[PDB]
Amino acid sequence: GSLSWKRCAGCGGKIADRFLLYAMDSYWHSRCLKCSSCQAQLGDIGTSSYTKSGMILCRNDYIRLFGNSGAGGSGGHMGSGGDVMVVGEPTLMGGEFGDEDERLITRLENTQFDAANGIDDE
Numbered sequence: 237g238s239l240s241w242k243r244c245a246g247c248g249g250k251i252a253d254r255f256l257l258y259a260m261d262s263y264w265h266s267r268c269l270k271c272s273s274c275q276a277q278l279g280d281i282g283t284s285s286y287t288k289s290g291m292i293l294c295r296n297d298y299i300r301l302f303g304n305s306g307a308g309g310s311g312g313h314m315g316s317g318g319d320v321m322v323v324g325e326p327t328l329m330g331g332e333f334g335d336e337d338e339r340l341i342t343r344l345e346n347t348q349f350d351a352a353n354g355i356d357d358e
């Protein structure tokens with residue numbers, strides 16, 4: 237698309253689908269990307285993605301795996317978390333583990349993004 241294809245690291249490679257996602261500088265499918273533990277829709281919980289141990293985790297997954305206590309001695313470290321689970325609605329803007337290690341999800345599931353492999357009818 238705007239650049240060269242980065243292939244789905246979830247399944248085979250070439251994404252000839254309408255539902256594409258960008259993660260880790262590669263491409264993924266909605267259920268190809270997926271969580272670590274929950275196995276939910278990373279692109280539906282908001283825009284956020286955590287990559288550690290070579291794994292792909294959501295915000296909740298992250299707190300469960302590498303959720304080091306970063307709430308109490310955190311004066312700043314806010315704004316991070318593109319999710320709509322904890323930072324979607326104002327609940328606690330105190331920067332409780334507001335790790336900026338995320339922001340790896342690029343999502344437009346249609347011919348809006350690089351989900352355009354080719355336009356060919358049957």
Ligand SMILES: [Zn+2]
Pocket residue numbers: 244245246247248264265268
């Ligand atoms: Zn895939």
Ligand SMILES: [Zn+2]
Pocket residue numbers: 271272273274275276293294295296297
């Ligand atoms: Zn998860």
